[PDB]
Structure 1
Amino acid sequence: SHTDIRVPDFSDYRRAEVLDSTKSSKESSDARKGFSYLITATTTVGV
């Protein structure tokens, strides 16, 4: 029965770069982490 389960689609929440199922996330990993950590670093600078 474990085979029957398939992870529900998360495309609505997925970022644009990882929307496609046909492209590697290795190329976009740095960009995505960079956006998130840029948010964090700017927040810490203001703090």
Structure 2
Amino acid sequence: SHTDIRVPDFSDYRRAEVLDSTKSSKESSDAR
């Protein structure tokens, strides 16, 4: 049942830089 655990969609809160799921996070961590 642990596999059924899925994080809900947070895209309503995520900043503009970390919004796409295929763009990493390290490149914009410094800016944020």
Question: TM above 0.5, one fold?
Answer: yes
Q: What number of residue pairs does the alignment pair up? A: 32
How much has 1:5 moved relative to structure 2? 1.1
Query: What percent of counterpart residues are identical?
Result: 100
Higher helix share goes to which structure?
1
Q: What secondary structure, in the 3-state scheme, does the structure 1 residue paired with 2:27 have?
A: helix
Gap regions ≥5 residues in structure 1: 33-47
How much has 1:14 moved relative to structure 2? 0.2
Moved over 2 A (4+): none
Instruction: Point out which structure has higher relative CO (alpha carbons under 8 A, 6+ apart).
Output: 2
Q: TM-score by structure 1 length?
A: 0.65
> Distance in 1 between the 2:13 and 2:24 partners?
18
Q: TM-score by structure 2 length?
A: 0.92
